[PDB]
C-alpha cells in the first residue's frame, strides 16, 4: 500500500490548486507517522486508535502553506487559506500532517512557485477546489485590468532562506477517511 509517493513526493502543488490521491485496497502502519513531522493531529477519530479500524476509502491531499498558516488546516478555522484555498468540514474525520521544508522549498533569492487565493466572493465549501484566476471586483461585476477596482485573486508565497519560522514553507498532507 503506497504512501512514500505522497509523503516523499519530489514536488507539491499550491494550496489553492491542491491535489488529491486515492488510497484503497490495502493497509499500512499508521506507526509510520515520527520526528519527521511537526504537526500530526487527528479529528473525529482518535490518533491512538487508528490501526484498529477499517476504511472503505482514504484520501490524501497534498500542498504547501507557510508556517503560521498551518493552524488553518483544521475544522472551524478562519483565514485566507481555510476560507479560500482548502476547507475542512466541522465533522471532519481524519488526520492532518505537516512538516518544515525550508531546506528544499526556500531559496536564497526566493522561491515563488507556491501560491494562494486571497480574494473570492464567498468562502469555499468543505473539500471544494477553485483554480479559476479571474479578475476580482469587490462590486461583483466582471472587470478587465488595468481597470480600477479590478484585482488579481492570487498571490505568491515568497519563500526566502532568511524568513522566520512563521513564513517558512511547510508541506502538508491531509488524510480523509470513510
Amino acid at each position, epitope marked *: 500500500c503506497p504512501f512514500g509517493e505522497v509523503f516523499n513526493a519530489t514536488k507539491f502543488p499550491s494550496v489553492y490548486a491542491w491535489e488529491r490521491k486515492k488510497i484503497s485496497n490495502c493497509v499500512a502502519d499508521y506507526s509510520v507517522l515520527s*520526528t*519527521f513531522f*511537526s504537526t500530526f493531529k487527528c479529528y473525529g477519530v482518535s490518533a491512538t486508535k487508528l490501526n484498529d479500524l477499517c476504511f472503505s476509502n482514504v484520501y490524501a491531499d497534498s500542498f504547501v502553506v507557510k*508556517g*503560521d498558516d*498551518v*493552524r488553518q488546516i483544521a475544522p472551524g478555522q478562519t483565514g485566507v487559506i481555510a476560507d479560500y484555498n482548502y476547507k475542512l468540514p466541522d465533522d471532519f474525520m481524519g488526520c492532518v500532517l505537516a*512538516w*518544515n521544508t*525550508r*531546506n528544499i522549498d526556500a531559496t536564497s533569492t526566493g522561491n515563488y512557485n507556491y501560491k494562494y487565493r486571497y480574494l473570492r466572493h464567498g468562502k469555499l465549501r468543505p473539500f471544494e477546489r477553485d483554480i479559476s484566476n479571474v479578475p476580482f471586483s469587490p462590486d461583483g461585476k466582471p472587470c478587465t485590468p488595468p481597470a480600477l477596482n479590478c484585482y488579481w485573486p492570487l498571490n505568491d508565497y515568497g519563500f*526566502y*532562506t*532568511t*524568513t*522566520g*519560522i*512563521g*513564513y517558512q514553507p511547510y508541506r502538508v498532507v491531509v488524510l480523509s477517511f470513510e
Partner: antibody
C-alpha cells in the same frame, strides 16, 4: 515546564575547538528552531545562527559562517554548537533560545542560562 | 541586515521614577520586536514580545508601544531589580539583530 539547560563553563586554548550544548525539555525539540546568541564581556548581544532538529536544516550568520557548527541529537533532545580556530575574540558568553509557531509569540520566550567560554594558552 | 538603533545607551534614574527606552528599526518589522532584560548574573528574561504584549509573570510596570519605526519600552515606577541591562531585537527575519543595549543605573 519548558527550560533550556546549557553545558558548564569551559576553558580552551587558542586555535583549539570546543563544543557546548543546550538541552531542551518540556516541549517538542523537533518543532522549534534553536538559536544561538553570543555576548562578549561588557559588549552587546549578537546572533550566531540556528538549527532545526526536525531535519537538521541550518541557518548561519554570515559573520560566524566559518567559526561555528550546529549539530543536533533528537534522541537526547540536545542542540550543539562547536567553535573552532579559537581566538581571543571568541572569549564570551553564549546563549541558546527558541523560535516556534506562531513566530510572533513562540520565540525568545525561554533562554539557556548562558555558557562561558574563555580562551587562554 | 535590519539595523536596530537603541537609545539611550545609558540611563540614570531613581526608585519610583518613570522611564522609556526607544528602538528604531531601519526596515518594516511588522511588530516583531521584543525587549529583553539581562540581570548582572547573566540570566536573560523576555519582557515584551510582539511589540507591546507583556510576557507572563512580568510586572505591570512594564509595557511596550509601537509608533512608526519607533518602538519603546516603558516602566511606570522603577524598582530595585529593574536596574539592569535592556536589549531590543527584531525577530522577523534572519539574521536576528539587536540594539546596542541600555544600562540602567541608580542616580545619586
Amino acid at each position: 515546564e519548558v527550560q533550556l539547560e546549557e553545558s558548564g563553563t569551559v576553558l580552551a586554548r587558542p586555535g583549539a575547538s570546543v563544543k557546548m550544548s543546550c538541552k531542551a525539555s518540556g516541549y517538542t525539540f523537533t518543532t522549534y528552531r534553536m538559536h544561538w546568541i553570543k555576548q562578549r564581556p561588557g559588549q552587546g548581544l549578537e546572533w550566531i545562527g540556528a538549527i532545526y532538529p526536525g531535519n537538521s536544516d541550518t541557518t548561519y550568520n554570515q559573520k560566524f559562517k566559518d567559526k561555528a557548527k550546529l549539530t543536533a541529537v533528537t534522541s537526547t533532545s540536545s542542540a550543539y554548537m562547536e567553535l573552532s580556530s579559537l581566538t581571543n575574540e571568541d572569549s564570551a558568553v553564549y546563549f541558546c533560545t527558541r523560535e516556534g509557531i506562531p513566530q510572533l509569540l513562540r520565540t525568545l520566550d525561554y533562554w539557556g542560562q548562558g555558557t562561558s567560554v574563555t580562551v587562554s594558552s | 541586515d535590519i539595523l536596530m538603533t537603541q537609545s539611550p545607551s545609558s540611563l540614570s534614574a531613581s526608585l519610583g521614577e518613570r522611564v522609556s527606552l526607544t528602538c528604531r528599526a531601519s526596515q518594516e518589522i511588522s511588530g516583531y520586536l521584543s525587549w529583553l532584560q539581562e540581570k548582572p548574573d547573566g540570566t536573560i528574561k523576555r519582557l515584551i514580545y510582539a511589540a507591546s504584549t507583556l510576557d507572563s509573570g512580568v510586572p505591570k510596570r512594564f509595557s511596550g508601544s509601537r509608533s512608526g519605526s519607533d518602538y519603546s519600552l516603558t516602566i511606570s515606577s522603577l524598582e530595585s531589580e529593574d536596574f539592569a541591562d535592556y536589549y531590543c531585537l527584531q525577530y522577523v527575519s534572519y539574521p536576528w539583530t539587536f540594539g546596542g543595549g541600555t544600562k540602567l543605573e541608580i542616580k545619586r
